[PDB]
Amino acid sequence: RTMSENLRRNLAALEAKISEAKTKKNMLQARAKAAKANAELQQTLAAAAAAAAAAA
Amino acid sequence: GLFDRLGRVVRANLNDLVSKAEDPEKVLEQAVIDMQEDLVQLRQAVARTIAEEKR
Amino acid sequence: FERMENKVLDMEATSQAAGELAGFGIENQFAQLEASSGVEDELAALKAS
Numbered sequence: 001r002t003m004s005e006n007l008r009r010n011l012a013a014l015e016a017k018i019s020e021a022k023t024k025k026n027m028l029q030a031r032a033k034a035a036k037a038n039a040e041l042q043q044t045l046a047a048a049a050a051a052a053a054a055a056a
Numbered sequence: 057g058l059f060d061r062l063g064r065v066v067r068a069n070l071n072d073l074v075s076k077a078e079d080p081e082k083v084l085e086q087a088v089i090d091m092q093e094d095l096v097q098l099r100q101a102v103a104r105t106i107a108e109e110k111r
Numbered sequence: 112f113e114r115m116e117n118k119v120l121d122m123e124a125t126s127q128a129a130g131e132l133a134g135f136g137i138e139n140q141f142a143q144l145e146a147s148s149g150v151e152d153e154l155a156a157l158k159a160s
Contacts, residue, residue, distance in 0.1 A: 001109050003105075004102075004105065004106055004109060007105070008102070011095075011099065014095055014098070018088065018091055018092060018095070021087075021088055021091070021112060022088055024116075025084055025085060025088060025112075028080075028084060028116055028119050029081060029084065031119055031120075031123050032080055032081055032119045032122060035119075035122040035123040035125075036126075038126040038127070038130055039122070039125070039126045039129075041130075042126065042129050042130055045133065075114070078115060078118075080115045080116075080118045080119050080122075083115050084112060084119075087112040087115070088112070
């Protein structure tokens with residue numbers, strides 16, 4: 001009964017950090033979609049400037 | 057040892073080769089799934105020891 | 112999870128820096144000025160009518 005107190009605290013400390021992890025997951029998955037959309041845009045502007053149709 | 061040093065080189069390349077297969081978007085939610093069911097297993101084992109203190 | 116968070120922060124910074132640097136340059140910067148189109152004289156001459 002001195003062990004079950006230790007385990008019973010360790011069990012609650014785990015679920016506390018699952019809750020934090022799950023809130024951060026949402027914010028990170030948002031940032032990864034935004035960054036990937038901007039990468040495709042900046043690649044499009046480069047290829048346009050490389051064709052330079054207005055110089056021809 | 058020389059073959060320790062070669063081992064740690066070849067082992068580190070293989071571990072890096074895996075690390076860049078991890079897609080941040082897929083693995084980051086699987087990690088939370090795994091960490092949730094770990095708590096389901098743990099709670100069963102704890103309760104099984106509480107039953108015996110009672111007994 | 113922590114190892115995968117750093118990958119996300121690397122992508123975000125790489126995108127933002129390339130976009131920020133392309134935000135410099137004379138044409139893109141002048142394009143942000145309101146009266147930048149250069150017809151304000153004939154526009155004014157029309158407004159006079």
